[PDB]
Amino acid sequence: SAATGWQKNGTGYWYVHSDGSYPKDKFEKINGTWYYFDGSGYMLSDRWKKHTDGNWYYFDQSGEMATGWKKIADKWYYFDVEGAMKTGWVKYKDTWYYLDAKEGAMVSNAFIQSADGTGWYYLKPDGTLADKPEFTVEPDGLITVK
């Protein structure tokens, strides 16, 4: 906790073990919290990382691995309990949400094709699933949903 723990040489943070010594290019758990250190010892803060397990990870300005829902650059993302960004459907409370399969951001006000390519799910403006959507159709074929 003096020459042994969180260190700061201007550019960023690194961390010192009694002796392992300082993590680089890996994850580390520190007082209960996961961080990632770049190839040069420096903690990632406010940054996306695409890991070796094919997952996307986010680290806040503080360096803490994101877990659960997190608004980032004005878009929602859900991260599983082990910090992996999720895509597709997720259960949150009483309802369902859908996260782009490409960028991973929550989708809203959209039709999502069903897995078997046969049908659709509508997600409202706030992103929730419509359990009971309502349609109206005008003569030109214009559709409103609610």
> Which positions touch ligand CHT (CB under 6 A)?
9, 14, 22, 27, 34, 40-42, 48, 56, 61-62, 69, 76, 82-83, 89, 92, 96, 103-104, 106, 115, 121, 127, 129
* Residue nearer to ligand CHT on the CB measure, 86 or 142: 86
6 is an interface residue for a copy of itself by CB under 8 A: yes
Query: In angstroms, rounded to a whole number, what is the distance separating the alpha carbons of residues 31 and 124?
Result: 40
Q: Which string of DSSP letters, residue by residue, matches 64-131? A: PBP-EEEE-SS-EEEE-TTSPBP-EEEEETTEEEEE-SSS-PBP-SEEEE-TTSS-EEEE-TTS-B-S
55 is an interface residue for a copy of itself by CB under 8 A: no
7-32 core/surface letters (b: 16 or more CB in 10 A; e: else): eeeeebbbbbeeeeeebeeeebeeee
Q: How many CB atoms neighbour CB 132 within 10 A?
A: 6
Q: Are 5 and 43 in contact (CB under 8 A)?
A: no
Those residues with Cβ within 8 angstroms of residue 124's Cβ, 6 or more apart along the chain or in another chain:
108, 109, 130
**Least Å from the CB of residue 83 to ligand CHT:** 5
**Contact partner at residue 94 from a copy of itself, ligand CHT, none, CB < 5 to 8 Å by partner kind:** a copy of itself
**Contact partner at residue 18 from ligand CHT, a copy of itself, none, CB < 5 to 8 Å by partner kind:** none
Among 1, 11, 18, 118, binds a copy of itself (CB under 8 A): 1
81 is an interface residue for a copy of itself by CB under 8 A: yes
**Contact partner at residue 23 from ligand CHT, a copy of itself, none, CB < 5 to 8 Å by partner kind:** none
**Residue numbers at the binding site for a copy of itself (CB under 8 A):** 1, 5-8, 13, 32-33, 62, 64, 68-69, 81, 91, 93-94
